[PDB]
């Protein structure tokens with residue numbers, strides 16, 4: 153398959169990237185170095201993951217080593233919820249740039265559509281455990297993102313975890329200057345997201361699938377939850393193709409015209425997960441994988457569910 157997708161800002165985005173949530177700071181530098189050595193050209197990062205400095209050490213080493221040129225890398229980060237304030241967005245972006253050792257990002261996303269009270273805590277709580285919101289809405293935060301493009305800090309802007317109506321809000325913004333380039337959402341065979349994906353694709357937004365393996369290392373996993381990697385129906389499709397279950401799970405979103413960002417810190421798996429450009433799932437395989445949808449989410453959070461902009465009340 154073609155390895156990059158054209159964005160609505162005119163840049164090309166690699167369809168396979170390396171995820172970094174939960175990658176320990178003492179392991180992620182090596183993970184990113186190995187990833188770049190074996191061909192990855194897209195890294196998915198975020199301030200809230202608390203490891204951007206260590207990601208940046210890897211990136212800088214590979215640039216210094218002339219393993220890859222900066223123009224060939226596609227580096228993504230995300231604005232955390234406590235920085236949805238007009239006067240805080242630029243500084244948040246600049247902190248991420250400083251940590252990653254970069255002078256621009258290829259793509260900067262609004263991490264979640266919910267703003268939280270600014271401060272040191274990533275999840276400021278009231279005395280009863282509810283997150284404390286910000287009064288600032290997704291449209292004013294979007295205008296702040298647009299300024300980053302115009303100041304040269306980021307090449308593209310986008311959104312993450314926005315539902316159908318929140319995407320529409322952005323597209324219908326009075327005076328919209330730049331459309332979102334990407335909506336990054338959870339997507340895998342048990343949460344197939346057909347409705348949201350068709351909406352975004354019909355509007356020219358590229359969708360990035362996160363947690364494509366079902367995030368088995370999520371901190372709130374329960375021993376009894378469904379497991380994609382262990383699903384014998386998926387194992388059977390993999391065996392037919394002489395591939396691993398992970399490779400099928402990565403190829404699946406690629407054939408839906410999605411970008412996909414599997415996470416690993418294991419060098420052998422980092423390599424395995426990149427070897428997904430030499431086989432094709434049939435249409436029947438694709439439809440079969442889609443049939444496994446159960447509307448099951450890795451990423452949700454009870455403490456945030458009353459926030460007026462919490463995204464997963466809406467059907468899609």
Ligand SMILES: NC(=O)C1=CN([C@@H]2O[C@H](COP(=O)(O)OP(=O)(O)OC[C@H]3O[C@@H](n4cnc5c(N)ncnc54)[C@H](OP(=O)(O)O)[C@@H]3O)[C@@H](O)[C@H]2O)C=CC1
Nearest residue numbers: 171172173362363364365366367369398414415416417418
């Ligand atoms: N925008 C948002 O709100 C969110 C963005 N994301 C992004 O998406 C990325 C991917 O999602 P994530 O939730 O991390 O989970 P993934 O679905 O990518 O699963 C990661 C887990 O799968 C394991 N794994 C990786 N490759 C294989 C393999 N070949 N065989 C077996 N196990 C494997 C990893 O183990 P190990 O590392 O030990 O090898 C790790 O435990 C995140 O890291 C982050 O960058 C994720 C959630 C939310």
Ligand SMILES: O=C(O)COc1cc(F)ccc1C(=S)NCc1ccc(Br)cc1F
Nearest residue numbers: 173198200201202264265266451452453456
């Ligand atoms: O968020 C990620 O990328 C991966 O997950 C996380 C990654 C982190 F580094 C810290 C917390 C999260 C959580 S708990 N995320 C879920 C979540 C956060 C905020 C809101 Br609004 C709803 C929600 F569901």
